Design a protein around this ligand. Sequence first.
Ligand SMILES: Nc1ncnc2c1ncn2[C@@H]1O[C@H](COP(=O)(O)O)[C@@H](O)[C@H]1O
Ligand SMILES: [Zn+2]
Length: 344
Amino acid sequence: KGYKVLAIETSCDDTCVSVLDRFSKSAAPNVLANLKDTLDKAHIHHQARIGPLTERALIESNAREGIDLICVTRGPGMPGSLSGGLDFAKGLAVAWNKPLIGVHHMLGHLLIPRMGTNGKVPQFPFVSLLVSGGHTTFVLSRAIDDHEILCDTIDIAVGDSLDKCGRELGFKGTMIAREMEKFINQDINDQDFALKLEMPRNMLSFSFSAFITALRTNLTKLGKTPEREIRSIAYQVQESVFDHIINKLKHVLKSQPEKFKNVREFVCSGGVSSNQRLRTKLETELFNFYYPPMDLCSDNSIMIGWAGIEIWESLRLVSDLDICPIRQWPLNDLLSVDGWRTDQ
Ligand SMILES: Nc1ncnc2c1ncn2[C@@H]1O[C@H](COP(=O)(O)O)[C@@H](O)[C@H]1O
Ligand SMILES: [Zn+2]
C-alpha cells in the first residue's frame, strides 16, 4: 500500500542521491537517505561518484530491493553532467524492472514546498520566487504541468552576484552571502550609517552583473580595508540587490493582473530565500508567504523524487527508457518533448 523512490540530481556541480518513503498517499513522504557529494571536471565528478553514492544510499536507507520508482533530472543543464545520472538511472530502472521519470530540474524547486503538506499547501494557482546561486526566476504555477516563467535573469543569479560582492568586501567561506548578512546584522544598528553607497524586450528580466562593477566603482572613491563602515556598506549592497528584485516583481504584478486573480500564496525558495531582510521586504512591499527550509532550497535530489511522485500520481505519466538529456528545456514544454507515457 506504499512505495519507495530513488532520486538522482546531476544537473549542477554536486552529485545528489536520495531515497524517499512514500508509505502513504494521504501523508507526506519521508526521507530514508539523502547524500550530496560536492565538487570540491563537472561531467567526470558525477561519473566517478554517482556509483558509490547510490550504493551507500541504498545501504543506509536499507532498501536496495524495495524501491518502486526511479526519478532523475533530465534537464536543463550540461549534457555531460545530466547523462551521468540519467544513464545510471536507466541502469537501475532496467535491472529492477521499475518505472522511470525524467524530471525537469526547475519543477523540483517549484513543487518542493508542497511535499511537507503532501499536495495541500500551496495549491494552484501560486507564484514562486526561485532565488539561488544559479537561479533567479519568478514563476506562475497554474497546474502540476502548467508552469509559466514571468521574469527570469539575463546574466547571473542573485546568489552569484552577492557572493561576488561579498568577496570584494571581503568575506570568505562556502556561502559568502550568508556570512555577509551576519557582519551587517551584528551591527544592524551598531554600524556607522556614514556611507551613502551608489548602486544601480517582450519579457521582463533580472540583472545582477552590474552590481559587482558598481561596487568596484564606489570603493575607488573611498578606501578598501572600520567594522562600523564595513557593516554599513554590506547593508546597502544587499538592500539595492533586493530592491531590484522587488521592483521587477512589482512590474510583473502590475502588467498582468489577470494572471494573478486566483493566487493567494507566494513561495520564495532558493538559497537566498533564507535571508531575513529579503523575506521582510517581500512581505512589506507587496496573499500568504511560504519559505522553504535551507536543506531543500539548495540543489538536492529530494525535490526531484517528490516531483516524480507528483507527476506519477496526478498526471499518471512515466518516461520512456530512450529519453535523452535536454540542454535547454522550456518549462512550458514540460510534456511537449518525447517521450512521456501513461500508466492510466
Ligand atoms: N541567508 C542567506 N542570505 C543571503 N544569501 C544566502 C543565504 N544563504 C545562502 N545564500 C546564498 O545562496 C547560494 C546557495 O544557494 P543554492 O544555490 O540554492 O545552493 C549562495 O550564493 C549563498 O551565498
Ligand atoms: Zn537548482
